[PDB]
Each structure stands twice: as structure tokens, then as C-alpha cells.
Enzyme design. Structure first.
Site, PDB file in Angstrom:
ATOM      1  N   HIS A 155       0.842  -1.206   0.000  1.00  0.00           N
ATOM      2  CA  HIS A 155       0.000   0.000   0.000  1.00  0.00           C
ATOM      3  C   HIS A 155       0.868   1.244   0.000  1.00  0.00           C
ATOM      4  O   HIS A 155       1.837   1.333   0.762  1.00  0.00           O
ATOM      5  CB  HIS A 155      -0.933   0.016   1.221  1.00  0.00           C
ATOM      6  N   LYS A 163       1.400  -0.729  15.242  1.00  0.00           N
ATOM      7  CA  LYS A 163       2.804  -0.850  15.653  1.00  0.00           C
ATOM      8  C   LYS A 163       3.158  -2.074  16.484  1.00  0.00           C
ATOM      9  O   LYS A 163       4.333  -2.369  16.659  1.00  0.00           O
ATOM     10  CB  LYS A 163       3.232   0.404  16.442  1.00  0.00           C
ATOM     11  N   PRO A 182      -3.916  -0.707  18.991  1.00  0.00           N
ATOM     12  CA  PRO A 182      -3.897  -1.048  17.558  1.00  0.00           C
ATOM     13  C   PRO A 182      -3.968   0.093  16.554  1.00  0.00           C
ATOM     14  O   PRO A 182      -3.584  -0.100  15.405  1.00  0.00           O
ATOM     15  CB  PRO A 182      -5.127  -1.936  17.394  1.00  0.00           C
ATOM     16  N   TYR A 216       3.931   6.402  10.226  1.00  0.00           N
ATOM     17  CA  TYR A 216       3.087   5.316   9.785  1.00  0.00           C
ATOM     18  C   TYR A 216       3.858   4.197   9.110  1.00  0.00           C
ATOM     19  O   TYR A 216       3.607   3.026   9.385  1.00  0.00           O
ATOM     20  CB  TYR A 216       1.982   5.831   8.866  1.00  0.00           C
ATOM     21  N   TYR A 249      -9.484   4.973   7.830  1.00  0.00           N
ATOM     22  CA  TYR A 249      -9.615   5.185   9.265  1.00  0.00           C
ATOM     23  C   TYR A 249     -10.684   6.264   9.344  1.00  0.00           C
ATOM     24  O   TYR A 249     -10.557   7.291   8.680  1.00  0.00           O
ATOM     25  CB  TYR A 249      -8.305   5.721   9.840  1.00  0.00           C
TER      26      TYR A 249
END
Ligand SMILES: Cc1cc2nc3c(=O)[nH]c(=O)nc-3n(C[C@H](O)[C@H](O)[C@H](O)COP(=O)(O)OP(=O)(O)OC[C@H]3O[C@@H](n4cnc5c(N)ncnc54)[C@H](O)[C@@H]3O)c2cc1C
Ligand SMILES: Cc1cc2nc3c(=O)[nH]c(=O)nc-3n(C[C@H](O)[C@H](O)[C@H](O)COP(=O)(O)OP(=O)(O)OC[C@H]3O[C@@H](n4cnc5c(N)ncnc54)[C@H](O)[C@@H]3O)c2cc1C
Ligand SMILES: Nc1ccc(C(=O)O)cc1
Ligand SMILES: Nc1ccc(C(=O)O)cc1
Lengths: 394, 394
Positions: free
Chosen positions: A72, A297, A293, A385, A201
Site C-alpha cells: 500500500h 505498531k 492497535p 506510519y 480510518y
């Protein structure tokens, strides 16, 4: 019974470390309380950092991942009736993340361990650690009624949050940092095509929602849920209605629903223990720290703890540099805190908190607008990220 | 008595707006409760954004500033025994900030207003606003016992946090967002050379400290202080000892101390009211919003509210576009929230909060390490610090 490194726990941490160690000539034995099937039943993680993908390659267990994993380059954040895409690849200077289920990664390591013929004792009951400060520590356990002893030079506690290893260190020697969030995540795995090619998200007034995936025909969705919730209270249909209510209309419209393959609730928590070692015992992964979550990580930090431990053990065995092992905690903690900080930030801007005042709701909305609208804000999210660089040691 | 725009308050907001308006042919009258001397007694602000420097130039009141003001290209943040410099100029793409006391800016505007012959009524007692929704609003006040009436087309409430203008809008029409911090700032003005050529913001276990300046021979220092504190409890000497205890040793060593010229305590607060207008009344500056001093945005936000109000009034008078005034609040609020968000962030990472758990102290320390060590983190601080761009309207 003897080995060089005893490994408590056959989750991703223990298997990865065991594989790395094996390939370099360092014998190791893994002890696991459960059965191979129980371990394979945990769904958990779906997002892997670039660095973890490379570690898998280094352990030579990346064939299936290279074939089935989805790379991604972006991820979406929806809030207040607008989706914003963060170009990870552009903003982080080329890094990406890979979506490959934790179940698969674990399956791959298990098969790789079996083929190499390395020792793994499943259903090792009542594991106990002894002589942690001596020159010769040992592990005792029971396999079908009889008590066995395993001698080793080092023990790597890779037994998760409820493992015995952290419990074996004198409590006075540890400093615990922990925060409990007033909510959990209700996740649903379905054999349906994901609603988007990238993750979404979503911050919505009703609570957080996340659209994820496992493959092109398998989806993973989550919705923020209060602590008092019981899974039996959530029918598949209630879940789909709830999920649809938290998403932007143009996304909820193309959602293909279906019967759940798995449904569970995971509470959110932050936990860090300092130091991460005691004598010849070294903690790794969830045994040493928990991150909510939201930043994805958890499994990734475990990989870095493992990368660090393995390289230090190599130095110790091959190069006779046993004193380098004292630096383990100092090294892992730097990466752990930045990752805890990132997960904490993601969690606070994406979820709806109980009894929040008008000012804080406004500040929350503004953090999103700011970080998502500034080139510099975007870059802080992205580089975090995809995962900050591992330190090389020495 | 009649004018086009009545201005309540002769602090920096009212004077700047009055000057801008005058230069464009729009008559205005300023009403101030205090005396010119009382107004000049407030020390307050020392840091000005690039945009405010330009507005001062546009109002043609920048001679003394261009001569005496210090342009800064950097600012320092000290924490855990280390100073980190943020290159504002580099990281924001060339912008800087200017240190020029609020007392001076106010003096410059007052002299400029006097020379132009514009009306200013000091000691205007009991100001009351009437007919805010009519086509002809008016202000009444008392000058030495007798009640006078001032007719106008618009009223600009530039009367600070305790002004009458915000109190004149039906409370039901307003939405208040506010946060009170459990501490205040104890500031000390001294005729001594500043300890550094750039500002130093310091996070120390004992509490926040800040080394600022007014000129090459005048310093301004602040220390975080509990709410229960009384200024008479703080001798100059106690202040110097306290300030020295919160700074890095190599900085405390070269500090030239001296007797205070002014000493006061200011509580920290965040306050925003929505909308910022009612009929023909428009709120500006501290009358509409308060930001804690940590980000140095107070006077700067007032300037932007003023820049926005003036440009809309021009459109209304010169161009007959009276309907554009309805957009005032929508426009100012965007900049206000981002600035509130920045000031809030600066305040939370630099100050020591009461009853803070181990996890939060660790996260605080980590925010500093992260933002101060990442090129992207640095850029988020810098672009916010120099001030985000004003919107052009239309
Ligand atoms: C909802 C959810 C989503 C997540 N999403 C992500 C994501 O996308 N990306 C990411 O990086 N992280 C994510 N994570 C985190 C990730 O799942 C964990 O951090 C990871 O599983 C850590 O692996 P581990 O090997 O340390 O521990 P574990 O997976 O817990 O395995 C530990 C093993 O040790 C065993 N064991 C326990 N006690 C004993 C004992 N006494 N003796 C012997 N064996 C014992 C346990 O049986 C277990 O098999 C998520 C977690 C959750 C729950
Ligand atoms: C410790 C401190 C440090 C700060 N540092 C900075 C910094 O470095 N940078 C920055 O941008 N900001 C900073 N500020 C904020 C800045 O001082 C204010 O935001 C600014 O003074 C706003 O100006 P104003 O004209 O809106 O209001 P004010 O300065 O309050 O003036 C309002 C005027 O209206 C008058 N008035 C009140 N009631 C009436 C009435 N009923 N009738 C008539 N007149 C009335 C008052 O007398 C006053 O003269 C700081 C503030 C403090 C206290
Ligand atoms: N942040 C997260 C992203 C994705 C998943 C998941 O796919 O399971 C979990 C957490
Ligand atoms: N952030 C701030 C910086 C400086 C001053 C000041 O010089 O008075 C006040 C606040």
C-alpha cells in the site's frame, strides 16, 4: 536437555527470533503453552512496516508474502464528511507498508521452522524460569505429566502480555508505564471484497471505524465500542448497520456485507516496562510492551525488538562480545517510546472519548484539519506510519 | 455626535483598526475606559509574526519598529539537559518573527492617531451599545458626568476579555469554548542584557521558564507558577534563584540579574466564542478569544481579525458590498482554531502539570524528542510559530 537460547512463546516474536537464530548457527528451542492450531486461530494484525518485510526476507520466509501480500502506498482518513488521502510513498520518501495477515506470517514461520527440523515443544505446561542471574539459567516445564529441565545460556521471553517471563523478574526491578483507554475495538473478519483498495480510518461522531483487508476476497472491519460490550450482543447485522452509519455515504453504498468468519473485542491499552531485561532473560514483543492497535505498531515493534536481540546475540556468540547485551533495553526503548507516542496520538484524534468538553472536541477536529492539510503535518503522520528507521547498534 | 465606525477600546486592536480605516477614508471614533497612561502601562507581548509586521507597514506606523525591532530567525527549546535550536527561517521557507514590545507598538499607533487628528475619547465611562440589529446602532457613554450619544453604522468591539461588547450580545446566541490551565506565568521585566540573542523556552522538572527580551538592554523572563501564588510573595531575588534553577547550567552562568521594573502574574486560559459578530457589532482580538501566551499568538490573532474586518469594511463602504460582512466570523475562526491548537500544544509539552502519571510524563518527554528531532516535526513547529498565512477573502 540443552540448547543455547531458550525461547518462551511461539507467536510471531518467538518464531522470528528462532528462525533468525537458526540461520546463523545458534541453536534455540521454543516452548509454547498452546497447540499449533490455537496459535493459528488468532487473527490480529494486518499491517506490516517496510522494515518487518525486510526482516522476513532476511529470515528467508518471504515467498508467500511476496506473492500474496498487498503493498500500500496510501491510507485514508475520513472525518466530518470528507476523506483525505495520505500519500505514504510520496511523503515518506518512497516507503510503503504491506498488508499480510498475522495468521499467515505465523503460518509461514511455523512451516519454515518445521522444515529446518528445529525444536519446538507445544503444550509445554507450567513453564518456570530459574537462575536468571547465574551463569547457567534453566527452564522447567511439563510435557504430558512429566517434569523436564532445559538448560541454556539465555532466555528470550516472547510470551506476550500474559506470559510468565515478565512475571519472573523481581517486580521491584521494573518500572511500569501504562494507560487504559475507556473503549475497545469490535472487529469482524468476513469473506467479502474490501470496500476500498486502501485502508480507511474514520472519525465519526458515533465513534471510530476502520475498513481493512486481508486479500482481495477477505475484509477486516472494526468499530469503536464501549468496555461494557459483550460480543454475543453484536449480531453480524447490527455490526453492518453500525459500520455503515460511521462511514461516508459514498463508501457505505458500495460495501458488500456478509456473514462473519470471526468476531471479537479487543480493549485498547498502552503499556511499557523498563528495563526489558534481567540477567540472562530478555523480553521481546508484547511481553515487554503493548500499544493500542490504532497505529499498527504492535507486531512491528516486536520485529524490531527481535532484530535487535538477534544481532546482539550474534555478536555475543560469533564474536565473543557478551557485554553488548547490556545495551538491549537502551536500544529498544528509543524506538518503543516513539511508536507508543505515535499510537497514542492516532488513538486520541480518531476515537470519541466519554465526557469530552466542547473545547477538546474542537481541538480534536482541528488536529485532523491541521495535520491533514499541511505538507509538514502529512509528513509527520506518514514517516511514523511507515515506521521510523531501526537503529544499527554498535 | 456621529461617525461611520465606532471602536470600543484603544488597545492594539482598536488602534490598528482605527489607523487602517483612517488611511482609507473611513471615519472612526475610538472609545477607551482608561487613560492613555494606564494603557501604556501594560507590558504583555513581545513577539510579532511576519504578517503583523506587514500590517503595521500598511498602516504606515512601522518607522520605529524597523529601527528598534529585533528580527529573529530561530528560537530555542531546552529540555532534559539539552538545548535544541529550531531554524524558523530555514524550516518555514524564509519567514521570521520580530521582537518588539506591545507597549511600543501601542505607543506608535497612539502617536500616529494623534498626528492625523482622528477622534479618541479616553475615560469614556459606562459605554453601552444599542440597536445592534437596527440599521442605525449607537453607543452611549459618559465623559465627566454628562451622558453623550454616538451614532454609527458599525461597532467594532475591541475591548479585550473584560469588555462590554461581548456582554452586549444575547448569551443564547453565543457558543463558548474554554479551558483553564492549573497554572499561571510570573513575568519579570528588567533593565538587563538578555541572556541569549534568541528566545529560550525551557521545560524543566520544576516547571516552565522562558528567557525573552525587549531590546539589547532590556529583558523579559517568565516562570511557570501555581494559581495560589501572590506576586508580593516573590522577591526579585527569589525569582532569579528560581529562574536559574530551571535553566541549563551554561545559560544560568552568564545571566545578568538586576532589579525588576515590573513584576506580574498572568493565568493561562484558552477561550473562543462563536460566532464573533451580532448584527452591526463585530468582535476582534481578546474580546473574542484568548490563547495562552506559550505560542505568542494573542496580539497576532488580533491583527488578523483586524486585517479581515478592515478589508471587509472597505468592500462595504467603497464598493457598496455590505453583504460580505456576514463572512467575518467564518473567516477569522479558521485561523483562530489553528492558532488555539498550536498554543494548546506548546502549552502541554512545555509546562509541568499537577498530578501527572508516569505514562503522560514519558509521552511529554517523547513529543519533544520527536518534534525536535524530525525534519518534519521541526517544520510543523516553525510554520506555526512564524504564523500561518492570512486568508485573502472574496
Ligand atoms: C485488534 C489487534 C490488531 C492489531 N493490529 C496490528 C497491526 O495491524 N500491526 C501491528 O504491528 N500490530 C498489530 N497488533 C499487535 C500484534 O498482534 C502483537 O503485537 C503481536 O501479536 C506480538 O507478538 P508476540 O509474539 O510478542 O506475542 P503473542 O502474539 O501474544 O504470542 C505470544 C505467545 O506466547 C505464548 N505463551 C503465553 N504464555 C506462555 C507461557 N507461560 N509459556 C509458554 N508460552 C506461553 C502465547 O501462547 C503466545 O502463543 C494488533 C493487535 C490486536 C489484538
Ligand atoms: C503574559 C502575556 C504575554 C503575551 N505575549 C504575547 C506575545 O508575545 N505575542 C502575541 O501575539 N500575544 C501575546 N499576548 C497577548 C496580547 O497581549 C493580547 O492578545 C492583546 O493585548 C489583544 O489586544 P486587544 O486590543 O484585543 O486587547 P487589550 O490589550 O485588552 O485592550 C483592550 C482595550 O479595551 C479597553 N476597554 C475594556 N473595557 C472597556 C469598556 N467597557 N469601554 C471602553 N474601553 C474598554 C481596555 O481598557 C483596553 O484598553 C500576551 C498576553 C499576555 C498577558
Ligand atoms: N491499525 C490497524 C490497521 C489494520 C488492522 C487490521 O487489518 O487488522 C488493525 C489495526
Ligand atoms: N511566547 C511568548 C514569548 C515572549 C513573550 C514576551 O517576550 O513577552 C511572551 C510570550
Amino acid at each position: 536437555m540443552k540448547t543455547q537460547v531458550a525461547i518462551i512463546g511461539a507467536g510471531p516474536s518467538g518464531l522470528l527470533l528462532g528462525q533468525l537464530l537458526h540461520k546463523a548457527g545458534i541453536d534455540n528451542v521454543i516452548l509454547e503453552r498452546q497447540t499449533p492450531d490455537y496459535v493459528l486461530g488468532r487473527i490480529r494484525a494486518g499491517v506490516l512496516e517496510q522494515g518487518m518485510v525486510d526482516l522476513l526476507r532476511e529470515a528467508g520466509v518471504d515467498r508467500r508474502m511476496a506473492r500474496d501480500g498487498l503493498v500500500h502506498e496510501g491510507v485514508e482518513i475520513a472525518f466530518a464528511g470528507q476523506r483525505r488521502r495520505i500519500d505514504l510513498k510520496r511523503l515518506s520518501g518512497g516507503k510503503t507498508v504491506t498488508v499480510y495477515g498475522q495468521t499467515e506470517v505465523t503460518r509461514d514461520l511455523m512451516e519454515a521452522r518445521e522444515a529446518c527440523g528445529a525444536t519446538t515443544v507445544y503444550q509445554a505446561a507450567e513453564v518456570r524460569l530459574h537462575d536468571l542471574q547465574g551463569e547457567r539459567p534453566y527452564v522447567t516445564f511439563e510435557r504430558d505429566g512429566e517434569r523436564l529441565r532445559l538448560d541454556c545460556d539465555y532466555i528470550a521471553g516472547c510470551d506476550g502480555f500474559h506470559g510468565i517471563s515478565r512475571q519472573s523478574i523481581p517486580a521491584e526491578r521494573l518500572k511500569v508505564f501504562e494507560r487504559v483507554y475507556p473503549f475497545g475495538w469490535l472487529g469482524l473478519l468476513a469473506d467479502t471484497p474490501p470496500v476500498s483498495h486502501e485502508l480507511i480510518y474514520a472519525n465519526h461522531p458515533r465513534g471510530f471505524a476502520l475498513c481493512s483487508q486481508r486479500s482481495a476476497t477477505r475484509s477486516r472491519y472494526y468499530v469503536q465500542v464501549p468496555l461494557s460490550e459483550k460480543v454475543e450482543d453484536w449480531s453480524d447485522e447490527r455490526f453492518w448497520t453500525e459500520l455503515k452509519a460511521r462511514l461516508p455515504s459514498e463508501v457505505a453504498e458500495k460495501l458488500v456485507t456478509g456473514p462473519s468468519l470471526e468476531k471479537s473485542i479487543a480493549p485498547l491499552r498502552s503499556f511499557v516496562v523498563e528495563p526489558m531485561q534481567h540477567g540472562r532473560l530478555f523480553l521481546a514483543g508484547d511481553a515487554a510492551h503493548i500499544v493500542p492497535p490504532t497505529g499498527a505498531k504492535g507486531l512491528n515493534l516486536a520485529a524490531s525488538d527481535v532484530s535487535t536481540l538477534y544481532r546482539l546475540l550474534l555478536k555475543a556468540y560469533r564474536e565473543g562480545r557478551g557485554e553488548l547485551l547490556e545495551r538491549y533495553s537502551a536500544i529498544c526503548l528509543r524506538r518503543i517510546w516513539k511508536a507508543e507516542r505515535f499510537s497514542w496520538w492516532m488513538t486520541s484524534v480518531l476515537h470519541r472519548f466519554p465526557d469530552t468538553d466542547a473545547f477538546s472536541q474542537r481541538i480534536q477536529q482541528t488536529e485532523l484539519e491541521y495535520y491533514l492539510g499541511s505538507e509538514a503535518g502529512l509528513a509527520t503522520i506518514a514517516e511514523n506510519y511507515v515506521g521510523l528507521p531501526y537503529e544499527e547498534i554498535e
